[PDB]
Design a protein around this ligand. Sequence first.
Ligand SMILES: *[C@@](C)(CO)[C@](*)(O)[C@H](Cc1ccccc1)NC(=O)[C@H](Cc1ccc(OC)cc1)NC(=O)[C@H](C)NC(=O)CN1CCOCC1
Ligand SMILES: *[C@@](C)(CO)[C@](*)(O)[C@H](Cc1ccccc1)NC(=O)[C@H](Cc1ccc(OC)cc1)NC(=O)[C@H](C)NC(=O)CN1CCOCC1
Ligand SMILES: *[C@@](C)(CO)[C@](*)(O)[C@H](Cc1ccccc1)NC(=O)[C@H](Cc1ccc(OC)cc1)NC(=O)[C@H](C)NC(=O)CN1CCOCC1
Ligand SMILES: *[C@@](C)(CO)[C@](*)(O)[C@H](Cc1ccccc1)NC(=O)[C@H](Cc1ccc(OC)cc1)NC(=O)[C@H](C)NC(=O)CN1CCOCC1
Ligand SMILES: [Mg+2]
Ligand SMILES: [Mg+2]
Ligand SMILES: [Mg+2]
Ligand SMILES: [Mg+2]
Ligand code: NA
Lengths: 195, 195, 222, 212, 196, 196, 204, 222, 233
Amino acid sequence: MDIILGIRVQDSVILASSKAVTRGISVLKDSDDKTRQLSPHTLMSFAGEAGDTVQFAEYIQANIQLYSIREDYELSPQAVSSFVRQELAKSIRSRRPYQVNVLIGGYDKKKNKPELYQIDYLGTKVELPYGAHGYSGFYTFSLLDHHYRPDMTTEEGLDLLKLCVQELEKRMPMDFKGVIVKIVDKDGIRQVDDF
Amino acid sequence: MDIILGIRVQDSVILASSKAVTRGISVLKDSDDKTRQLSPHTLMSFAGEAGDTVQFAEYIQANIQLYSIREDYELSPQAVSSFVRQELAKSIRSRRPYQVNVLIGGYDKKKNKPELYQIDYLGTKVELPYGAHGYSGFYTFSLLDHHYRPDMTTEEGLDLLKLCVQELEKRMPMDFKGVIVKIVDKDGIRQVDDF
Amino acid sequence: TTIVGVKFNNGVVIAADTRSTQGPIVADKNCAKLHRISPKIWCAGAGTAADTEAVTQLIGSNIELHSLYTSREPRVVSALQMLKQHLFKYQGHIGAYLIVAGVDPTGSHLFSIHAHGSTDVGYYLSLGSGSLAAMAVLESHWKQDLTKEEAIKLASDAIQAGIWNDLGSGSNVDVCVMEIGKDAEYLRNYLTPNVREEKQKSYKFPRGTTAVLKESIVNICD
Amino acid sequence: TTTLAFRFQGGIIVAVDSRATAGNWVASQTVKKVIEINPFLLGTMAGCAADCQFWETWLGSQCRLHELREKERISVAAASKILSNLVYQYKGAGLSMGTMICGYTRKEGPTIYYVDSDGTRLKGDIFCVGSGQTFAYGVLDSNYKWDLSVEDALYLGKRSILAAAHRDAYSGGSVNLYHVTEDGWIYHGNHDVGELFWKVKEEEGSFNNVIG
Amino acid sequence: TSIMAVTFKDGVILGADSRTTTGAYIANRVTDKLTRVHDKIWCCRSGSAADTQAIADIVQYHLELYTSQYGTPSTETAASVFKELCYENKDNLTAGIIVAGYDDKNKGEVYTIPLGGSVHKLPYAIAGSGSTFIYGYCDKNFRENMSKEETVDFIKHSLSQAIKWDGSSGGVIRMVVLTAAGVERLIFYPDEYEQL
Amino acid sequence: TSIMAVTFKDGVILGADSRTTTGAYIANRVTDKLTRVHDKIWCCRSGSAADTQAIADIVQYHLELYTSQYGTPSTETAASVFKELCYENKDNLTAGIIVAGYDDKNKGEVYTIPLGGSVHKLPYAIAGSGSTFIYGYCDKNFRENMSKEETVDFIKHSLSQAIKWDGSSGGVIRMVVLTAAGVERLIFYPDEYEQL
Amino acid sequence: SDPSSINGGIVVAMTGKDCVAIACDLRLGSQSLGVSNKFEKIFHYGHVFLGITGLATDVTTLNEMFRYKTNLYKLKEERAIEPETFTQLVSSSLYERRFGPYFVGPVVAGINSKSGKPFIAGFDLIGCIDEAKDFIVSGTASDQLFGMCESLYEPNLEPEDLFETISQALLNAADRDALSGWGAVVYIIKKDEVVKRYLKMRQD
Amino acid sequence: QFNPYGDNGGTILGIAGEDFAVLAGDTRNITDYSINSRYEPKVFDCGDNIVMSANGFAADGDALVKRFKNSVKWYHFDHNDKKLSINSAARNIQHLLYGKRFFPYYVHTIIAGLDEDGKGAVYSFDPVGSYEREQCRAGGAAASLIMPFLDNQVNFKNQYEPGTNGKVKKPLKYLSVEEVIKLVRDSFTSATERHIQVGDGLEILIVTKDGVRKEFYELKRD
Amino acid sequence: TQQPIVTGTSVISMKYDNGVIIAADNLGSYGSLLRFNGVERLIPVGDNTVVGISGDISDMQHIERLLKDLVTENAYDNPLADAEEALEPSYIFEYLATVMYQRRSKMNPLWNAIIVAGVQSNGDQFLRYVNLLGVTYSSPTLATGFGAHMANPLLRKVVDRESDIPKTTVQVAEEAIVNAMRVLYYRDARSSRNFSLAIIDKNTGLTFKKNLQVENMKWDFAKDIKGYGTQKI
Ligand SMILES: *[C@@](C)(CO)[C@](*)(O)[C@H](Cc1ccccc1)NC(=O)[C@H](Cc1ccc(OC)cc1)NC(=O)[C@H](C)NC(=O)CN1CCOCC1
Ligand SMILES: *[C@@](C)(CO)[C@](*)(O)[C@H](Cc1ccccc1)NC(=O)[C@H](Cc1ccc(OC)cc1)NC(=O)[C@H](C)NC(=O)CN1CCOCC1
Ligand SMILES: *[C@@](C)(CO)[C@](*)(O)[C@H](Cc1ccccc1)NC(=O)[C@H](Cc1ccc(OC)cc1)NC(=O)[C@H](C)NC(=O)CN1CCOCC1
Ligand SMILES: *[C@@](C)(CO)[C@](*)(O)[C@H](Cc1ccccc1)NC(=O)[C@H](Cc1ccc(OC)cc1)NC(=O)[C@H](C)NC(=O)CN1CCOCC1
Ligand SMILES: [Mg+2]
Ligand SMILES: [Mg+2]
Ligand SMILES: [Mg+2]
Ligand SMILES: [Mg+2]
Ligand code: NA
C-alpha cells in the first residue's frame, strides 16, 4: 500500500493506485491492484494497514452487491460513500479499528455527473475535484491546484495524472513500482493497460 | 546514503555507490557521489548518518594526503585500511561516535594486486572478494556467492555488478536513483559514466 | 469555582461565584452553579461543570419520583445518600464536588460531597479552588446562632474572598436561602461587583467594510 | 516555512515565504527569510528562527573577515562550508536549520548549496526547503526547464511559494523574490498572498478547488 | 488519623481524633470517625473516608437485616461482615477499621481489620497514621480490667500524644463508651488534652 | 536502627540497639552503633552503615587535628563538623546522626542531625527507624536533671519498646555514659530488657 | 494526536437587535496538509442553527444524529424544535457519551418563533451548556475569537452592522491560526428571513 | 524533580506611532491560581529612550532586563557616551537571549522607542533571540486574544474600502497617541475579561523625543 | 536537584502606617511527623530588618549563616557600620535574591520561600518576597505556602491597596496577623500553635515577640456533629 490518487474531470473519474506490496526490506509483489468494483459505475481504491485494507474493501463490496441484488438497482456514488463513511465511523471507536483510507470514484447515472469522494480511516468524508491519501498529497495537491481545470477531458485528465506520477517517481523516497489506472464514466469501469 | 557495494576481481576493485540523498519524504538529490579519493590508487566509499559520513571521509582524505606529501610516497591499501579502522575504533568509545560504514578499494602497486576492505562504524575490518554495507548485503552476498569467480576480468566484474543493481532495483523498498561506479586498478581511479 | 454553605437560626444558606474556566480562559462569565434538586433542597457544585449539572439533575429527577411515590416532601439525607452512592460507584471519575443543603420535615441540613463519595457534616462549609480563601473568612467571622441576614452576609463575604483572591473564581455572587416554614428564595446575581467599564471606543464598522463573494437566501420553511 | 532556489539559463531564482509559527499560533506574517550576506551572496532561512537568524548573520561576519584577510570575495562553497562545519560542531545539541547558500563568483559561476543542521551539505541546481517543500517541488519540478526566461523563472518561483503557502498550514504571509546574476543579486519585491492569490487565480485560471 | 478501641471491666471504649486531610489542608477539623453500625456495635474508621464510609453503610444495612430475622448480632458477626467486604475487595479499598461492641454474655470485645482484610481479636487496638507514635506508650500503660475513668484517661493520654506528633491527626478527641448502662458520647477539646 | 541520647544531671548518656540489616536478614546482631569521635564526644549512627562510618572517620580525623592545634573541641564544634559533611553532601548521603558530648563548662549536650543536614540542639534525642514507636513514650517520661540510674532506666525502657515493635531493631542494648568521672560502657541483654 | 486539533476549524455566534448571526470557516485538513476548502461546519434543523468544530468525523456524525433526532421530534410533536429545547437535546446527547466523547465544540444559534427572542449557546465536548447574551466562540482559534469578540462587540446591533462585526471577528482570528481559514461563511438570521454570505479571505 | 521554570502570567503590548511609541503591560503577578502582587511593574525605562519588558517567567525576565540595563551602561563607558540606537539594542538583546539557547530565558521580550529618523519603533523577541521590527505586537499570556485585534485596528487587516467590491484596501495610516491609548485600554479590558492571569492594573509607558511618560489605569481585580 | 527534608510552613506579613509586621510558627516538620518544636524561622538582621524563611530548614540554617556573615563583612573598614552605612533591608534582600537565582540556575536550589521585612533609613516600609526559583515580588501583604491561600485574603481586607497603608494602625495590623495565624492552625496540617512575631516600626524600632500562642479558638460547635449524614446518635 501507499499511493492512491483520484481526479474528477468533466465526464469521468480517474483513479491511480500504486502496484507495490512491500514487507520489510523486500518488495513481495509489483503488480498489485489496490481497488474493488463496488457496483458497475462505482470504484473504490484503498490504502493502509496490511490485511485490513482488502478485508474492508471486500466487506464493503459484498454489502453493495447485496443491496444491488435485493433492490435490482444501483446505489448512487453519494449513497455508497455515505455508507462507507458510516462503516469507518463505527470502526474508529471499535476494539480494533480498520486502519484503511479510501477513495470512491463513481459516475452518477441520474445526474450524469462524475463524483470523487475522499474518506480517511476516521470516517472523514469530502467530495473533491482531485484527491489523494498518504504522503502523495503533499506533492499532488499543489501540482493539481496549478494544472487542473474543471472542464478537462478524460485524455487531458490522464496527462494531468502522468504529471503527478512523474513528480512522485522523482521525489518520493520509496519505489512504488508504477500505478494501475482506471476510468469511471457513463459506460462503467475500464482499466488503462499501458501506463 | 544507503547502498554501497564492492567487488574485487583479478586486476581491479570496483565500487558501486547509490546516488540518492533522501531526507524525510523528499529525495533532495539524485546525483550524489558517496566516495573520496584518499590517494591515487585508493578509493573509499561511505554510508551512514547524515553529516558524519562526509565529515569523516574528508577527515581521512586530509590525513592520507598529508602523509603522501610528508613522505613523498603512497601508503598501501592495507596500511590505509588499518589507519581508518583505528580511527573508527577510537570513535566508537567517544562522546559522539562517527556513525559511518566504509568500503576501501585499492590497488597495491608493490604486490600488483587489487584489495577490498570492509569496515563498519565499530571498527570491524575484513578483507573480502566482495563486500556491501547496509541492507544491500542481504541480497548481493548470496548472489555473488553464486556468480562470482576469483579470476574474472573488469568487464566481467561490471556485468556481475549490473546483476546486483538489477536485483536491488527489483526487491529494495526505496528508490536509490541508480549508482555511480568507479574502478581502481594499476592505472589509478576512473569513473564509469554510462551505467 | 468557589462555593459555600452556612447554617443559621431557622435554616441554611448557600452561595457561589459565576466563573467557568477552560484552562486560563474564562468560558462563561455568568454561569449558574446553584442547582435545584427539589423545591427546598438546593446544591452548590464545584469541579467538572457537566458532572455537577448532570449528577444533580439525575438525583433531582429520582427525588421527584420518590416524593410522588411516598407522598412526602423529599429529605436532604435522601439526596445525600443517592448522590454519594452514585459518585462512589464511579470511583471519582465523575468529578463533582457538591455542597448539599435544604429544609425538610426533619429540619434544616448542610452537607458536602466529594467526587469519590465521601460526605461531611457542618455548620459552615466551602468547596472548590477558592475554598481556602472562603474558609479563611468563614473561620474568622462565623459564630453560633447566626441570623438570616448575618448568614447571607457571611456567605457572600466568603464568596467574595474567592472572587478577588482566587483566579479560578470571579464575576458575580449567587445566593439561595432555605428557611424553615418558608419558600426557598433563589437570589440570582445577588451581588454584581465586577461590571465592565465603558469602552473607550465604538468598533462599529462602516457598512461594506467586509469583502463578500456570494449571497443567497436560506430556506428554513417546509 | 517554504523556501526554494533553482539554477537556470539566466542565473539563480530565490523565493521564500514570510510566515513564522509557534505551534498552530501564527507568530508573524512579515518575516525576512533571506539574508543578504554581500552583493553576490544570499542565504535562505528555514527551521528555528533564532538559529537561522543568529548563525546566518554570524556567517556574514565570517564572510566579511575572509575578504578583509584574503582581499577577495569568499566562494559560495567556502561560505556554505563555514556554516556546515559550524552546525556539525553542534550536532546533537538541538539546532534546527534548513539553509540554502546561493550566489555567484567568477571561478564557480552561479552556485547553490543546501546546508542543514544534521551536517548535510549538497551542491545542486534545484532545492526546496521547509515544512512546505513538497508543495513547492510539485509545481516547480513540473514546470522547470533550464531555458526559462528571467521573467518566467521569477514567476515560477513566485508561483511555487504561493502553491505551498496555500496548502501548507505553516507557510504563507507573503513572497519575497530575488534574482542572482553575474552582476549580483536583485530584489524583485514583496508579494502579499492576500492579493497575489486572487490575482493569480483570475489571470491564470488555476486554483479551481477554491470557491471563486 | 489516630484511632483506638479499648476493652475494660464494664465494657469497651472507642476513641478517635477529628481531623480529615486532603494533602496538608484540613478539609474538616470536627470529623466524627466513630460510627454506629448497631445499637451497641460501633467502629473506628481510618484510611479512605469514601471507602470506609461506603463499607460502614453496607455493614449497617446487613446488621439491620440480620436483626430483623435473627435478633441482635454478636460483635464477632459484625467484624465478620466488615472483613468479608474488606478482604474480597482488597484491591479496590484502602480501609483500616476497628470494630468494637458490647454483648451481655461476651462483655466488651475489640476486633481490628487492617488493609489486607485479616481479622484480629484483641484486648485493645490502635490504628491510623498517628498510631505509630504510641505503640510504645500504649503497650507500657495498658492493663486488663481497667475502670471507666482509667480507660478514658488511657485513651485521652494516648490520642493526645498521637495528635501531638502526627500532622494528619488533630482537633478534638471524641470517645464512645459501650456498657450495659447504654451508650455515652464524650468529647475533649485541645485546651484540655494538649497540656497533659 | 533504634538510637537515642539523653542529657542528665551529671552529663549525658548515649544508647543504641545492635542490629544491622540487609533486607530482612540480620547481617550483624552485635553491632556497635555508638562511636567515639573524641575522648568525651560520641555519636549514634543511623541510616547507611557505610555513609555514617565514612563520616565518623572523617570527623574523628578533624577533631584529632583540631586538638593538636587548639586543644579540646566543644560538643557544638563536633556537631558543626558533622553537619558540614552531611549538609554539603546531602544528595549522596543517607545518614541520621546524634552527637553527644561532655564539657566541664557546658556539661552534657545533645545535637541531632537528620537527613537534610540541619542541626538541632535538644535535651534528649531519638532517631532511627525504631524511634517512631517511642515518640509518645519518651515525651511523656522524659524529665530534665534526671539521675544516672533514672536516665539508664529511661533509655533501657525506651529502646526496649523500640526493639519490640521495630523489626529493623534488636539484639543487645549498648549504652555509653559521659560524665566528669570518665567514660563508662554498659550492655543489656534480651533476657533482661524483653520482660520489662 | 489531539483530536480537537487534527482537522481544524472555527465557529462564532452573535446576537443583535431582533436577530442572530453564526459564522464558520471552510477549512478541513490533516494537521499541516490542507485537504478541503468547502467543508462547512454550520447546519440547520428547521429554524435552529448548529455550528460544530473539532474532529470532522464527529462533526459529520453529530449532524446526521441531530437531523435524525429532530426529524422524529417533529413527527411526534407536530412542530419544529426551538433553540432552547434543541440546546438541551445536544447536552443530553453529548453527556450520554461521557466516558467516550465526541471531540467537538458545538454552538447553537436561532430565534424562538414564539417569543421572538434571539438565542445562542455553546457546549464543551461533554455537554456543559454555556448560554450567553452577547457571543459564543468555538474552535482552534477560540482564544483569538474571544479577544476579537470581547473588543468589537456591542449590544443591539442591526443585522447589516452585526454582519460586519462578526465577519471581522472571524476573519482576523482565523488569520492568526494555522489550522483555521481557507474561506468563510456567515449566516444572518432574522425572524423570518435568513441570508448566507461567503466571505473573501486570504487563502494561506 | 526540580523544575527551574515557572509561569508568572500577565501580558504586554507595544504599539508604534509616527513620532512616538507605547509599551504597555498589566501589573498583575501570579503563580498557579494565586495572586502574588496586584502592582508589580514589568515595563522599564532602560535609558537612551528605550523601554523594555520581558514577560513570562519573572525571574528570567528581571534577570534579562537587569543585564540589558547593564549593557546600556557599559556601552556608554566603552563608546564615549554614545546613544544606543533602538536597532542596536535589539541586536544586543538577541545575543543576550541566544547566549542561553540551551537553557533559555522563558520570556517574550518587547522593546520600544524611536529609530534614528525619529519615527516610532517596536521590536519583539522570542525566548531564544529571534527578533523583528513591527508596528504592533502583543506578548505574554493573553497575546493570542489581543494580537488579532491589533492586526484589525492598527494595520487595518481584512478591512476594505466600502463600495469598492473588496478590491481596494483600507489605506494604512499612523495613529495619534490618543487613538493608540484607546486601543491599549480596550485591548487590556477585553483581555482581563477572558483571561484569568490578566487584571488588577495597567501601566503604559509612552516614548517621545521629549522623553518617557507614564500612565496608569485600574483593571478588574477578579 | 534536591528534595526538602525538615521543613517550615507559612510565613505571613503586612505593611502598616509606620512600618511592617511579620510572623511565622516555630515548627520543623519531617514529612507528616511534627518533629521539632523549638525552631525560630524569623531571623533579625540588625535593628531594622527581619527575614522570615519557610521551606527546607537545613537550607534556612545556611542562609542564617550567610546573613550573620554579611553583618560581619559590612562592619569591616566601616566606621559608619551602625549609622549611615548600616545594612538596609533592600541590600539584604537583593543579596539573597541574587543567591537564590544563581542556585536555581545551577540546578541546585535553596529550597526556600523568603520574605524580607524591614524599614529603610528614610522611613519607607520594605516588604519583598523571594523563593527557590529566584522569583521576586512585593505587595502590601505577602505570605508563603498556605499563608498565600488563607492569610492574604484576610490581610487584604485590611490593606487592599497602597492608599490603605496610612489608614492602618499597628494595633489593627497586628490583630489581623494574629487572627491569620489562628486560621492557619485550624486548617494547615503542618502548622503549630506556638509562633513568633516581629514588628519593625520607624519610630519604636524592632520589637521581637517570642513564644506566642494561638488562642480564643472556636471548638465548642464540634460537640453537636454526628457521623457523616444519616447518623442520629
Ligand atoms: C471553578 C470555576 C473551577 O475552576 C468551578 O469548579 C467550575 C464549576 C462549575 C460548575 C458548574 C458550572 C460551571 C462551573 N468548574 C469549571 O468551570 C471546570 C473546571 C475544570 C476543568 C477541567 C477539569 O478536569 C480536567 C476540572 C475542572 N470547567 C469545565 O468543566 C469546563 C466547562 N469543561 C472543560 O474544561 C472540559 N472538560 C471536560 C471534562 O474533562 C476535561 C475537560
Ligand atoms: C516555517 C514557518 C515553519 O516554521 C519556517 O520554517 C519558519 C522559518 C523562519 C525563519 C526565520 C525567521 C522566522 C521563521 N520557522 C519558524 O517559524 C519556527 C518553527 C520552528 C520552531 C522551533 C523549531 O525547533 C526548535 C523549529 C522550527 N518558529 C520559531 O522559531 C518560533 C518563532 N520560535 C519558537 O518556537 C521559540 N522556540 C524555539 C526553540 O527553543 C525554544 C523557543
Ligand atoms: C488520617 C487522616 C490518615 O489515615 C485518617 O485515617 C482519616 C480517616 C478519616 C477521615 C475522615 C472520615 C473518616 C475517617 N483519613 C482521611 O482523612 C483521608 C486520608 C486518606 C485519603 C486517601 C487514602 O487513600 C485512598 C488514604 C487516606 N482523607 C480523605 O479520604 C479525603 C476526604 N479525600 C482525599 O484525600 C481525596 N483522595 C481520594 C482518594 O484518592 C486520593 C485523593
Ligand atoms: C537500622 C537497622 C535501620 O535504620 C539502622 O539505621 C542501621 C544503622 C547502622 C548499622 C550498622 C552500623 C551503624 C549504624 N542501618 C543499617 O543496618 C543499614 C540499613 C540501611 C541500608 C541502606 C540505607 O540507604 C542507603 C539505609 C539504611 N544497613 C546497611 O547499611 C547494610 C550493612 N548494607 C546494605 O543494606 C547494602 N545497601 C547499600 C546501600 O543501598 C542498598 C543496599
Ligand atoms: Mg480525509
Ligand atoms: Mg525486634
Ligand atoms: Mg498556508
Ligand atoms: Mg479572582
Ligand atoms: Na512548524
